[PDB]
Every structure is written in structure tokens, then in C-alpha cells.
Design an enzyme around this catalytic site. Structure first.
Site, PDB file in Angstrom:
ATOM      1  N   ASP A 204     -68.803  41.243  41.013  1.00  0.00           N
ATOM      2  CA  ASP A 204     -67.403  40.775  41.126  1.00  0.00           C
ATOM      3  C   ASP A 204     -67.521  39.918  42.485  1.00  0.00           C
ATOM      4  O   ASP A 204     -67.700  40.429  43.665  1.00  0.00           O
ATOM      5  CB  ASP A 204     -66.465  42.078  41.309  1.00  0.00           C
ATOM      6  CG  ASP A 204     -65.108  41.615  41.638  1.00  0.00           C
ATOM      7  OD1 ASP A 204     -64.841  40.535  42.093  1.00  0.00           O
ATOM      8  OD2 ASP A 204     -64.396  42.602  41.412  1.00  0.00           O
TER       9      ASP A 204
ATOM     10  N   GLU B 125     -65.510  50.215  50.496  1.00  0.00           N
ATOM     11  CA  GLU B 125     -64.857  49.824  49.031  1.00  0.00           C
ATOM     12  C   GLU B 125     -64.497  50.875  48.369  1.00  0.00           C
ATOM     13  O   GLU B 125     -65.352  51.366  47.786  1.00  0.00           O
ATOM     14  CB  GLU B 125     -65.687  48.644  48.414  1.00  0.00           C
ATOM     15  CG  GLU B 125     -65.008  47.625  47.384  1.00  0.00           C
ATOM     16  CD  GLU B 125     -64.666  48.526  46.145  1.00  0.00           C
ATOM     17  OE1 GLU B 125     -63.572  49.216  46.302  1.00  0.00           O
ATOM     18  OE2 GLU B 125     -65.381  48.262  45.350  1.00  0.00           O
TER      19      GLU B 125
ATOM     20  N   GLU C 274     -57.945  57.010  41.034  1.00  0.00           N
ATOM     21  CA  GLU C 274     -58.966  57.159  41.098  1.00  0.00           C
ATOM     22  C   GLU C 274     -59.959  56.508  42.192  1.00  0.00           C
ATOM     23  O   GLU C 274     -60.928  55.924  42.276  1.00  0.00           O
ATOM     24  CB  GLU C 274     -60.150  56.857  39.842  1.00  0.00           C
TER      25      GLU C 274
ATOM     26  N   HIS D  21     -62.887  42.837  39.137  1.00  0.00           N
ATOM     27  CA  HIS D  21     -62.981  43.940  38.027  1.00  0.00           C
ATOM     28  C   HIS D  21     -61.763  44.841  38.042  1.00  0.00           C
ATOM     29  O   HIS D  21     -61.773  45.668  37.133  1.00  0.00           O
ATOM     30  CB  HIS D  21     -64.354  44.689  38.351  1.00  0.00           C
ATOM     31  CG  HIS D  21     -64.264  45.500  39.325  1.00  0.00           C
ATOM     32  ND1 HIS D  21     -64.434  45.165  40.958  1.00  0.00           N
ATOM     33  CD2 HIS D  21     -64.053  46.837  39.529  1.00  0.00           C
ATOM     34  CE1 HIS D  21     -63.904  46.325  41.531  1.00  0.00           C
ATOM     35  NE2 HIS D  21     -63.935  47.389  40.892  1.00  0.00           N
TER      36      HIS D  21
END
Ligand SMILES: O=C(NCC(=O)N1CCCC1)Nc1ccc2cnccc2c1
Ligand SMILES: O=C(NCC(=O)N1CCCC1)Nc1ccc2cnccc2c1
Lengths: 300, 300
Positions: free
Chosen positions: B11, B104, B113, B254
Site C-alpha cells: 500500500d 501504523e 480493530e 487497503h
């Protein structure tokens, strides 16, 4: 969650093959007692009722069964179809034997996370002498692939990642079988059958198997992967036989194809007979020997 | 399994935004002690080392950490980067405080999540007085969507399924938020910010929130869904600030976009100010009120 039953319904090759089998061979269902193993939303049970089943028993362990119950009522089929929640190994059916078992049980590469064990359990416990199970015949095939760009994308990719070495990652990605639709132009051999199953005579024991294979190479190229897929046959006592393939030369299905990447691509010539060996062991693993390397693959 | 770290590396918007932030603001890293929360393959830790970090601590609970260890050695960075396996809440770091936290951590719709709880834990326990956390600023936005064909595909689809009624399934699919890239031509309002987070001053408590919103409609159409996305800012003390969006008007990432389907599509006119309310509760749920209907959505 419900989306996934929706995806399977929208797989036209899948659902229409079962539809056609059932509707075009009503003599198989007419006045019979049918068991639908892993019935999901109950669609196959409703086909069977429409084709004249006297009684249909739909079994599923999942929560989807409560939807199926409402679906059966919406279509006024509760006088013909009874739904039962649980595993086929645990539930109490309100009969001793059934005439016909139908199931959509197939996993990726036929056997990964399949419901076949349950269907075989049902056959042995509940199928009447002289009864039938559909689909009755399945095969698995392998085919050679050449895709140097994709190999580069998955493997050589790791030599330099934003300026840093990541080579060690190659060994973590190689063992992961990939589920994906292949461009059919990347196929470089004729397919080779590695397994034939008749569900009337198969045991759970036969699902772990070994097969020598020969791929008849059709293009001089670099072989970078081996792909696998399966074909499904409705045959026994049919006037209108039905078959569908999940191979890359046919219309895509939600099973797509299964891809086993080769760590070391090797050259092949058109007309060569490329020999190897494949073994499936109990989640499954697939061990492949080809060009004097051996790798075991899983589907995580 | 390793494939997913690979997808995140590939990504480019994601990985290059972090790269650019770190490489173009080396004064933030030079001779500093850095904590990389959820380090994965260690790529961010290696950027930080390259930008002159004195020490980098990379933490991850996953098995990927063993790959990261080998990756760090392959790049001869073991004198600068130490990897530690476990949860940030449980591990022993070999220092008391760090100067900079990088992570990240972002989930779908920013918070599904996500690893944010862990990053905030790290901030409060380990960040030096006057230290910094990056990315430092995040926002969430909503945007109205018109796609009558897709709505038909998900909803009206269930009225007739191979000749049978399945209407009851509509209520099972509506609550499932969809993660998918939207065709930007289907957007029918300007976006509206519903949440701004500064990671220096945010607590876990602020991640459950409510917001009234107004969507400025830009096309007379049928509204069939509400989409959400997030933007990520690297700002504090930067000479070269960096921002990326995960919205449908920007290059796909993504994270794609998150889509909340409306059970009952309703008409809107260009120039209308469409008002509603959104609340996020602890897996998260999203409750949406719009056009006098209220629905709660989850990401299963
Ligand atoms: O639902 C969408 N995609 C997911 C999907 O097709 N499946 C099928 C199987 C289960 C998940 N995608 C949109 C995307 C945009 C939409 C806008 N308005 C209404 C509906 C919309 C639906
Ligand atoms: O690997 C393939 N697709 C999966 C994939 O790109 N990712 C990225 C993130 C993790 C999974 N797909 C093929 C498909 C065909 C291939 C043929 N030869 C060599 C390699 C091949 C790879």
C-alpha cells in the site's frame, strides 16, 4: 457473515448447476425423502421440494438455519421441508433413512475446509440401501503456470523493500497456497487429473491420497507455479447429466483456483512431459515434488 | 498470514506517507529514542534508524516479530533497533521513557480493530515529557452515496432468488458495514468531518463519541448509503508536513472505504443540507440516524 451465503447464491455456475440437476432430473426426487447436508439458506431443499420431494430434511449447524426457517415459511414449504439445527453427527432426524443426499460441501481445491466428512457420515448412517448422493462424482486436477511478473511480485519483491533487505520473507510466503482466478493465457500445460472420487464408494480414509502426475507442457516458458482445481459431476441415474469445472479455462466461480508458488522457477519446453508427485494430508496440507524440489503448502 | 504484512507494504499511500514523514523530518528522529508500536516487519523502525535515531524499540505480539529480527540483522541494524515480542501492556522495555512514538495502528473507518488503545497506553506510560506521537492528527468523515443498482444488488435481490422469496435476509445484510472502494462518481454530497483526534491529548474515553452532521448535497438523486473514511496527518514540529486521505476521491488504500447501507433509500436535492447523527460505541458499532430512521451497524 450472511454476505457469504449471498456470495454463494450469486455464484451462478454453482447454484444453477444444482438447480438444473434437480429440476431436469425430477424422477430422482419425486416422492422421495431427501437430506440436505449443510443447507444454508435452504435453497437446495426448496429446489428438491419443487421437483416433487415427499419430505426434505435440511441440516445446518450455523445461525443461518434460523433464516432458512423463515425462508421456508415465506415460500409455504413447511409441510415439505423440516429444518434442523446442529451437526449431522449430533442431530436427531425424524426418520431412520433417506433416499437421496444432496449437499454443496466443496472447499477450495475441493478439500480445504470442506464438509465432505459430514456428507460421508450422512451417507453411511442415513442413506437407504440403493439410495444416492449428489453430486456423485468429483475430480481434482493440476495444471502448470508461467507468470514471471507475478513471481517477481511475490518473491523478488522482498530483496529490496523501500531500500531494505527482506529476503527472509520469501520462505514465509512460499508455503501459503493462494486462492485466486488465473489468467488462462498463463497456463502452460494440459491439465492432469490427480484424484477421482465417487461419493457412493468413498471413505474419509480416501481423502488423504498421493498421486504421481505428468503435465504435458504446451508452451516453452518459465514454470513459476502449479495450479489446482476441481470438477463436479451429477451422473448417477440422470437423464440430464450436469457438470461444472472450477478450472481457469471455465467461467470463474467463488472457488477460483488454488495456486502453489514455486520457490525456484524452472524452464520447460513445449511437448515435454513434466513429472511430479502430489500428496494431500489431514486444515489440509499439500506436498508437491517437481523438478527435484519438494514443498509442503497450506491454506491459512 | 505473512501475505497481509505484504499487502500493507505494497500500500504505497500508506508506506510512502510514513517514509516521507520520517525521511523529510530527520530532526524529529536524530539522536532520539523511538518506540514503534505494532512494528510488524520492522519497516518503520528501519526508516527511523536511517533518519538518525539513536535507538529504536519495535514491539509486536505477533509471530511476524521473528521475521523482523532477521530483517533487522540482514540490514545490519541490530546495533540500533531492538525488537521485543509481546503486547505493549505486558513487555519490559530496556528504558523508562522514549522521545518519539510511531505506529501504523489504524483500522477500517479508523477505529474498527485498531491498535489505538495500545498506542495511547504507550503514550501515557512511556512518552517523555515534551515527547511526540505520530501520526499526531486523525479525522473521520462521512459522505452521502447514491447507487440504486448496488442497492438493488444487495437488497431487492432477496425478493426473488431462483424463483423463491428470501425477503427476510434483507434485515441480516443491512447491519453489516461493507469495506470496499467506491466509485467516486457515486458520491452525492460534500464530506463532513465527524471526529478530530490529536494523539497527544486523546484518551481511550474519546474514542466512543457522538456527532451531529450535515451533508451538503451536490446532486439530486436517491441516497442509498452513507460512506465513511479517515485522514491521517503528520504535523507537530514538521518542516515537511504529510497528509493522506483514505476517501473515495483519493488513491485507493487497503483501508478502502466503509459503507453503511440504508434499508430505505430516500430522495435528496442538490443544495439540500441533510442532517443526521452518528455514534460510535465499544469490535465497534456505529449507530446512524438519518431521514428519521436509525440503524446500528457492525463490521463482522
Ligand atoms: O455491498 C457492497 N459490496 C459488498 C457485496 O456486494 N457483497 C455481496 C456479498 C456480500 C457482500 N457494496 C456497495 C457499495 C455501495 C453501495 C451504495 N448504495 C447501496 C449499496 C451499496 C453497496
Ligand atoms: O500470489 C498471488 N496473489 C496473491 C497476492 O498477490 N498476494 C499479495 C499479498 C499477499 C497475497 N497470485 C499469483 C498468481 C499466479 C502466479 C504464478 N506464478 C507465480 C506466482 C503467482 C502468484
Amino acid at each position: 457473515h450472511y454476505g457469504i451465503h449471498e456470495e454463494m447464491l450469486k455464484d451462478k455456475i454453482r447454484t444453477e448447476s444444482y438447480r438444473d440437476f434437480i429440476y431436469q432430473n425430477p424422477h430422482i426426487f419425486k416422492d422421495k425423502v431427501v437430506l440436505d447436508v449443510g443447507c444454508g439458506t435452504g435453497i437446495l431443499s426448496m429446489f428438491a421440494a419443487k421437483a416433487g420431494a415427499k419430505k426434505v430434511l435440511g441440516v445446518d449447524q450455523s445461525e443461518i438455519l434460523y433464516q432458512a426457517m423463515d425462508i421456508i415459511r415465506l415460500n409455504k414449504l413447511e409441510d415439505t421441508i423440516t429444518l434442523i439445527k446442529g451437526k449431522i453427527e449430533e442431530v436427531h432426524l425424524p426418520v431412520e433413512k433417506v433416499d437421496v443426499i444432496i449437499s454443496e460441501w466443496m472447499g477450495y481445491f475441493l478439500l480445504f475446509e470442506s464438509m465432505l466428512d459430514s456428507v460421508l457420515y450422512a451417507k453411511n448412517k442415513y442413506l437407504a440401501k440403493g439410495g444416492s448422493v449428489y453430486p456423485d462424482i468429483c475430480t481434482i486436477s493440476l495444471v502448470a503456470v508461467s507468470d514471471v511478473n507475478k513471481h517477481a511480485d511475490r518473491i523478488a519483491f522482498w530483496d529490496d523493500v523501500y531500500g531494505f533487505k527482506m529476503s527472509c520473507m520469501k520462505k514465509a510466503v512460499i508455503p501459503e497456497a493462494v486462492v485466486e482466478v488465473l489468467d488462462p493465457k498463463t497456463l502452460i500445460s494440459e491439465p492432469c487429473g490427480i484424484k477421482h472420487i465417487d461419493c457412493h464408494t468413498t471413505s474419509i480414509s480416501d481423502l488423504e491420497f498421493s498421486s504421481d502426475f505428468t503435465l504435458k507442457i504446451t508452451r516453452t516458458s518459465m514454470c513459476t507455479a502449479i495450479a489446482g482445481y476441481f470438477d463436479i459431476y451429477f451422473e448417477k441415474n440422470c437423464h440430464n447429466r450436469v457438470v461444472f469445472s472450477t478450472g481457469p479455462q471455465s467461467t470463474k466461480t467463488h472457488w477460483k483456483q488454488t495456486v502453489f508458488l514455486l520457490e525456484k522457477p524452472f524452464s520447460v519446453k513445449a511437448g515435454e512431459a513434466l513429472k511430479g508427485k502430489v500428496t494431500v494430508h489431514k486444515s489440509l496440507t499439500v506436498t508437491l515434488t517437481l523438478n527435484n524440489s519438494t514443498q509442503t503448502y497450506g491454506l491459512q
